[PDB]
Symmetry: C3
Subunit: 132 residues, 3 copies
């Protein structure tokens, strides 16, 4: 197939509660129309091997940033960022995994808050490497 998305935050995301989905407000790309910006979720259209990458810039405040890459309800990989000045800092990670159709991939803001601007520091992408 052909599946690829790239989303960014152009405004701050500061959730009321812990463990909320990171939703996005700008698509850089949505080849295959698999990503929903308003839920921040990737909906796997076909069984195959997929790559995901994300970079999240934290607010310059004295709260650490914890981000999980989620597969449905499971933690796949996580990222951490914190600076005590306080300064902005970047939580990043990646994953390559076999998915089944209907699987949902998303970013969970476990703790902290994420910076957004037109310069788009905070990003989330994925694509299909191998079908099957």
């Amino acid at each position: 197939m052909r599946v690829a998305f790239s989303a960014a935050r152009t405004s701050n995301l500061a959730p009321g509660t812990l463990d909320q989905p990171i939703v996005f407000d700008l698509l850089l790309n949505n080849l295959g129309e698999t990503f929903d910006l308003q839920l921040g979720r990737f909906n796997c259209p076909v069984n195959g091997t997929y790559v995901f990458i994300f970079h999240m810039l934290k607010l310059a405040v004295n709260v650490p940033l914890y981000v999980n890459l989620m597969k449905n309800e499971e933690v796949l990989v996580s990222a951490y960022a914190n600076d005590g000045a306080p300064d902005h800092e970047t939580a990043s990670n990646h994953a390559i995994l076999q998915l089944f159709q209907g699987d949902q991939i998303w970013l969970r803001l476990h703790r902290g808050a994420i910076y957004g601007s037109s310069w788009k520091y905070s990003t989330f992408s994925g694509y299909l490497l191998y079908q099957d």
Copy 2:
């Protein structure tokens, strides 16, 4: 078939804002689309492309700001700073539909970049899907 991977092996500390990040070592250039002296990727065919970069800043108390550029537009950005002062890494990625002739490059908005033979500061891109 398109893929490049470039590295900085000596420091880049321009003095002024908004300079192009030029590279002095190619780890890869399948398709010969990257100009080292220019630090520019020249899109050879319409398609979906992936880019990734990691920039290590100098151990100085001036923040590092880097933009991934599409032609003259800022696409995604990265920030890094530590007040100790210590080295720190500005990184991001993007997946984009490009048209032939489009140019992708890194802009050093502010700050300075560390370069050595161990190659901390890198920039790569490749063709995901043709058309």
Copy 3:
């Protein structure tokens, strides 16, 4: 078709400099390249390969230095340090032409790597273009 994704779920604080980063779980191993106990990717066919890694350091004031190695050579490197001390992330990537039999692996030059069930410390690679 080749792709692997590995993570560390327990800490790695070797003792000696320049030790191989070994992993304890594969998130994927399409093509059954890469062995867990050595932490090495065994190139199965001539071609172009992409590698990416994220290493979270222990919160100690010893800097983390990581090398991506091709056989016995340093390809690209990552650095992370925070003087608080706080956890921090060493990350990099590379795209390179390989020959079959070439070995790709991560070297812990200095420092220590954090591992937990949340998987902050990861290493993946996949085949971009096979050489026919």
